[PDB]
Design a protein around this ligand. Structure first.
Ligand SMILES: Cc1cc(C)c2c(CP(=O)(O)O)cc(=O)oc2c1
Ligand SMILES: [Zn+2]
Ligand SMILES: [Zn+2]
Length: 229
């Protein structure tokens, strides 16, 4: 099922949805996989998250050209860490419109990231303000509250059983919540549960560092985060 393409891996999850996977060495700790999504919406392609680097992100665009061969209309990135925004320059060099939480764009320079071109803003209840996410097609963007980071956002794919929790959600057998260096430990559990409640029909939960899982990824992540309080 997995397709090795250069140093990256691509996996079809639904007729119009693929997961992209890229790897970066964390010195002394190993090569860390990070996952994002690629969605075909009619005659265009939508991307969720870059790869770790510009070169890897250009390779995602190469794979899209060969395997889908439609223009990439936009990309949305889910927080201001390298695994999600490290390849912003490659998207801009390709002429792709880029979107991130306003807070992600504000944090980008201090995190060593390049900001996206456009800022998403969110209603008090977490749903993106639609005027800031034009032409997003089936992508439903939701801010669940602070968790893995204060700016983390999540994305559901309308017409599918798929929702993307990014680095907020860990798989149903995960032993830890990963990198908590920028985390909001007080609010993590509630933010994880809010993601689940925003996408109740999503039976396939896609996340940054594990293969897609059932909704037990959400319950287990929240249950682990209960211990942070
Ligand atoms: C200190 C630290 C920071 C980051 C950003 C990472 C990441 C990327 P993140 O998952 O937090 O978006 C992965 C990792 O394995 O370790 C880290 C350690
Ligand atoms: Zn992160
Ligand atoms: Zn992560």
């Amino acid at each position: 099922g997995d397709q090795r393409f250069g140093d990256l891996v691509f996996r079809q999850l639904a007729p119009n949805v693929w997961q992209h996977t890229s790897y970066l060495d964390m010195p002394g700790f190993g090569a860390v996989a990070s996952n994002g999504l690629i969605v075909r919406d009619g005659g265009r392609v939508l991307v969720v998250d870059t790869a770790w680097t510009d070169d890897q992100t250009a390779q995602i665009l190469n794979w899209i050209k060969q395997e889908i061969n439609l223009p990439v209309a936009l990309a949305v990135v889910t927080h201001a860490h390298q695994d999600k925004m490290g390849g912003m320059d490659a998207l801009h060099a390709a002429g792709i419109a880029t979107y991130a939480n306003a807070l992600s764009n504000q944090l980008a320079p201090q995190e060593g990231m390049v900001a996206a071109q456009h800022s998403l803003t969110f209603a008090a209840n977490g749903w993106v303000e639609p005027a800031t996410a034009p032409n997003f097609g089936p992508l439903k963007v939701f801010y669940p509250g602070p968790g893995h980071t204060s700016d983390n956002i999540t994305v559901g794919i309308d017409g599918t059983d798929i929702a993307f929790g990014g680095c907020l959600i860990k798989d149903s057998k995960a032993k830890s919540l990963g990198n908590l260096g920028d985390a909001d430990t007080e609010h993590y559990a509630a933010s994880a549960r809010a993601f689940g409640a925003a996408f109740p029909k999503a039976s396939m939960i896609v996340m940054s560092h594990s293969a897609p899982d059932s909704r037990a990824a959400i319950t287990h992540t929240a249950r682990m985060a209960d211990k942070l309080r």
